């Protein structure tokens, strides 16, 4: 219940999704991203199943994929002439210079109003 | 005077939809199911 305040928002969002009319859809809403789990409502007849299974499945490669894709991303920045690409790439991303700009926004399309343009500025510091 | 009769407790013809009288159903409106849970 540590991000239950969060989660207050997550359920309304969830909520909302179900509420609305986007239905009679074949097809999946992925686009790219997570990995897809699958149950029926049915007055929640067998989610458990499903995630049992699921986790089980899941434990068997064991997040290899990723895992063993970060390990080697490490390892490949770890040799000589592979950090060079990545910290120009870095480099040229971010830049700082005496004194100048950092990332920043940049409000310059039509807004409710100059005070929250400038409470948007302040958060975004 | 028709009635729709009754059924005898008998889930055998209850399940059915089997009644004594003028009518007879499809079928004892299935109301879901329950499974056993997995343990911790």
Do not use: C
């Given at each position: 219940?540590?991000?239950?305040?969060?989660?207050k928002?997550?359920?309304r969002?969830f909520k909302?999704?179900?509420?609305?009319?986007l239905?009679?859809?074949?097809?999946?809403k992925?686009?790219?991203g997570?990995?897809?789990?699958e149950?029926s409502?049915?007055?929640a007849?067998?989610?458990?199943?499903?995630?049992?299974?699921?986790?089980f499945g899941s434990?068997?490669?064991?997040?290899?994929?990723?895992?063993?894709?970060i390990?080697?991303?490490?390892?490949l920045?770890n040799?000589?002439?592979?950090?060079?690409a990545v910290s120009?790439?870095?480099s040229?991303?971010i830049?700082?210079?005496?004194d100048?700009?950092v990332?920043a926004?940049?409000?310059?399309?039509?807004?409710?109003?100059?005070?929250?343009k400038?409470?948007?500025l302040?958060?975004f510091? | 005077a028709?009635?729709?009769?009754?059924?005898?407790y008998?889930?055998?013809?209850i399940?059915?939809?089997q009644?004594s009288?003028?009518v007879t159903?499809?079928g004892?409106?299935?109301?879901?199911?329950?499974?056993?849970?997995?343990?911790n």
């Amino acid at each position: 219940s540590l991000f239950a305040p969060w989660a207050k928002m997550d359920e309304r969002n969830f909520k909302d999704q179900e509420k609305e009319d986007l239905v009679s859809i074949t097809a999946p809403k992925l686009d790219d991203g997570a990995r897809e789990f699958e149950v029926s409502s049915n007055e929640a007849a067998s989610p458990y199943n499903a995630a049992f299974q699921t986790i089980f499945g899941s434990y068997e490669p064991g997040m290899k994929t990723t895992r063993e894709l970060i390990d080697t991303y490490r390892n490949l920045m770890n040799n000589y002439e592979v950090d060079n690409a990545v910290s120009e790439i870095v480099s040229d991303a971010i830049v700082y210079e005496d004194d100048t700009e950092v990332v920043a926004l940049n409000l310059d399309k039509s807004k409710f109003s100059p005070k929250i343009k400038n409470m948007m500025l302040d958060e975004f510091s | 005077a028709e009635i729709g009769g009754d059924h005898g407790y008998n889930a055998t013809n209850i399940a059915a939809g089997q009644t004594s009288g003028a009518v007879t159903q499809i079928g004892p409106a299935v109301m879901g199911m329950v499974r056993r849970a997995i343990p911790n």
